[PDB]
Amino acid sequence: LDFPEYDGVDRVVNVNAKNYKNVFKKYEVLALLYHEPPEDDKASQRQFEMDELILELAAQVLEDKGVGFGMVDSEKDAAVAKKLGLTEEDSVYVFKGDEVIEYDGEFSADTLVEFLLDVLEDPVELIEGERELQAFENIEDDNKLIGYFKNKDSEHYKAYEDAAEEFHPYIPFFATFDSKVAKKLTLKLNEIDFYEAFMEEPVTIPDKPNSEEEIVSFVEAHKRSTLRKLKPESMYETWEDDLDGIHIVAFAEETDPDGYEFLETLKAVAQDNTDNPDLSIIWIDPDDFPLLVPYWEKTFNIDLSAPQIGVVNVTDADSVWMEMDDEEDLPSAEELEDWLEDVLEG
Amino acid sequence: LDFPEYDGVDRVVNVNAKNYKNVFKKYEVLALLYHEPPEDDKASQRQFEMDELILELAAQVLEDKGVGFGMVDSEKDAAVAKKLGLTEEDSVYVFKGDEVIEYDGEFSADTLVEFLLDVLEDPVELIEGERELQAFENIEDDNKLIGYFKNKDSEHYKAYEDAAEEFHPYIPFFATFDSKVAKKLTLKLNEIDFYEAFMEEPVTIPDKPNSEEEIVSFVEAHKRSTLRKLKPESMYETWEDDLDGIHIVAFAEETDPDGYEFLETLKAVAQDNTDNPDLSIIWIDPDDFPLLVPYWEKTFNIDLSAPQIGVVNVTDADSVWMEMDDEEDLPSAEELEDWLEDVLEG
Ligand SMILES: [Ca+2]
Ligand SMILES: [Ca+2]
Ligand SMILES: [Ca+2]
Ligand SMILES: [Ca+2]
Ligand SMILES: [Ca+2]
Ligand SMILES: [Ca+2]
Ligand SMILES: [Ca+2]
Ligand SMILES: [Ca+2]
Ligand SMILES: [Ca+2]
Ligand SMILES: [Ca+2]
Ligand SMILES: [Ca+2]
Ligand SMILES: [Ca+2]
Ligand SMILES: [Ca+2]
Ligand SMILES: [Ca+2]
Ligand SMILES: [Ca+2]
Ligand SMILES: [Ca+2]
Ligand SMILES: [Ca+2]
Ligand SMILES: [Ca+2]
Ligand SMILES: [Ca+2]
Ligand SMILES: [Ca+2]
Ligand SMILES: [Ca+2]
Ligand SMILES: [Ca+2]
Ligand SMILES: [Ca+2]
Ligand SMILES: [Ca+2]
Ligand SMILES: [Ca+2]
Ligand SMILES: [Ca+2]
């Protein structure tokens, strides 16, 4: 009645020109680890075996749900990788229907399975009644969309659902057919509002009713939020998406009163500067990455039991941190704005 | 710049009558896995080696923070185990100061390290100003206490801090010296309010000012909340604490609009029946245990993409689940009360 342990059945194989058509046929959803060939030393061999074991456990856990896992060698299987669109080494590409979803997060069985379980869900969630509306409003650490349509047979709803599939499961798409919900949201019929992460005010997609292409192009242009949360499921995607080799990194434990107070200041600063295309802040809650906390404290020379904020230069592997005597020496929004300005324009 | 990998240094040893005094001296905080001797078959041997490797990784991660890990064989080391108070096999006993903290949760390096990082924090958190007060009010999935005292030198504050140590890190103790915060909480000087998990209304500890013993005895009597959340850090403690071999188990994904709506009904039912000593509901959010979701769906024969609630008989290894056609066929509070009554008084 406990966590599953690998049962030794070989379910994850190398996916190559000989078998790839049969593997895609065997599984309704197929997730492919695109990897460089392991080096020949024993350490690199062991790590490769341990990585495969992670996939084996996930494949066992999800067998009855139509999910399969495979591995594609970027050298041996280069031709198949190209035909399938596998280009970023160490990414897992998830094939659902007509979509190819890139996973670029923690390589662990639990996080992988949680992601696949999100992939298997439908790309549009409905909102009806006050409690469901409250659930929608509680979402803030993701970009989200909500649109008001006549009903599920509306061509405009179907275009919205088709657009949701492009960003699944990263950007939740919500829909309502309830005119009372739409009024509380100030959504006119066939209007779509995009709520950037951590923002209070939405941006309405122009020129409604909107086609799939109009929604997709809009979401792609607003995909990067001023403030974004580092999450295990997407940690490497976020970290690799630096702006001119610079991240602003804020550490704050949401549940701690001092972390909450600092996070509220951070949100206020992001909201007041949300249209500055050069501002990108990563919020890391230490409680989400316990195994990295000592490493971050050593690397950055900071105490993560208190809120911290700094500028990390990925190009030069260097960083500077705002000097805060303790948890009670937090900057005002204005002081935080000014400190970022001083370090960046410099 | 990534998750740590075990470096092969042996930091976790068997703790026995010969070395236990030196181990306790080597480490400021020491966590001891109390385990039955591994069976001699190769499978049991491998599992024991894999368990030790989990401790090795945690010990590496926390080395610079004064934490050590050890293992105590319940047969070979029975005399030392008794002297140290190790009685429940498969529990990890954490020695901090004068306290012995039992860990009875997921045996994984990340969850273990997160718990130890919580252990290392101070047992009382202060509340000052409106934002910190809001952080206090946002806490609902734990029992919590808050007391109003003159200042940190008050003998009554010191008694409160001494009591907090007994329940650290499971039941957060908050304190304020701010008369404006105390007024919003309706806390008179030296009063202590206990907020049961998921309850709106607190219970004031009687006969203030309160001694350590009065607080400890009060908290012990109110320790078990009507509604409690299954969490990795304490999942086995919670599951083993059944009431006459019965758990009421509710599955609800907090972030999903249907899960939120059902959870609100569950909270309302718990609040209206909070004084019924026979009512104990475990809320499991599937998003917290992805690796167990397929196992639960198979074992209970339910769809965990929708909210579910049932009665699980641990004695007879049997369960019954409320029949809900889909996510929109949710019971009212009254219907849920009546359904529990019908299945239990039967
Ligand atoms: Ca294999
Ligand atoms: Ca497409
Ligand atoms: Ca990557
Ligand atoms: Ca986990
Ligand atoms: Ca509007
Ligand atoms: Ca249009
Ligand atoms: Ca990527
Ligand atoms: Ca704090
Ligand atoms: Ca504080
Ligand atoms: Ca913005
Ligand atoms: Ca955590
Ligand atoms: Ca923590
Ligand atoms: Ca403060
Ligand atoms: Ca060892
Ligand atoms: Ca004691
Ligand atoms: Ca136990
Ligand atoms: Ca983890
Ligand atoms: Ca009161
Ligand atoms: Ca008293
Ligand atoms: Ca226990
Ligand atoms: Ca739903
Ligand atoms: Ca619904
Ligand atoms: Ca109660
Ligand atoms: Ca989760
Ligand atoms: Ca989920
Ligand atoms: Ca509903």
TrEMBL record, chains A, B:
Which sites carry carbohydrate?
313
Residues that bind Ca(2+) 16: 186, 191
Q: Which residues bind Ca(2+) 1?
A: 10, 12, 52, 56
Q: What residues does Ca(2+) 8 bind to?
A: 118, 169
Q: Where does Ca(2+) 5 bind?
A: 99, 166
* Chain sites annotated for binding Ca(2+) 6: 106, 110
User: What does this chain do?
Assistant: Calsequestrin is a high-capacity, moderate affinity, calcium-binding protein and thus acts as an internal calcium store in muscle. Calcium ions are bound by clusters of acidic residues at the protein surface, especially at the interface between subunits. Can bind around 60 Ca(2+) ions. Regulates the release of lumenal Ca(2+) via the calcium release channel RYR2; this plays an important role in triggering muscle contraction. Plays a role in excitation-contraction coupling in the heart and in regulating the rate of heart beats. Calsequestrin is a high-capacity, moderate affinity, calcium-binding protein and thus acts as an internal calcium store in muscle. Calcium ions are bound by clusters of acidic residues at the protein surface, often at the interface between subunits. Can bind around 80 Ca(2+) ions. Regulates the release of lumenal Ca(2+) via the calcium release channel RYR1; this plays an important role in triggering muscle contraction. Negatively regulates store-operated Ca(2+) entry (SOCE) activity.
Q: Which UniProt keywords apply?
A: Calcium, Endoplasmic reticulum, Glycoprotein, Membrane, Metal-binding, Mitochondrion, Muscle protein, Sarcoplasmic reticulum, Signal
Organism per entry: Bos taurus
Q: Which residues bind Ca(2+) 20?
A: 209, 214
* Binding-site residues, Ca(2+) 2: 14-15, 71, 77
> Might you report a single GO cellular component term?
mitochondrial matrix
Q: What is this protein called?
A: Calsequestrin
For the ligand (Ca(2+) 19), the binding residues are 207, 214
| Chain residues that bind Ca(2+) 11 | 125, 256, 258, 327
**What family name appears in the similarity comment?**
Belongs to the calsequestrin family.
Q: Which GO terms describe its biological process?
A: endoplasmic reticulum organization; positive regulation of release of sequestered calcium ion into cytosol; protein polymerization; regulation of skeletal muscle contraction by regulation of release of sequestered calcium ion; regulation of store-operated calcium entry; response to heat; sarcomere organization
What positions does the entry give for Ca(2+) 12 binding?
132, 258, 261, 328
Q: Which residues bind Ca(2+) 10?
A: 118, 287
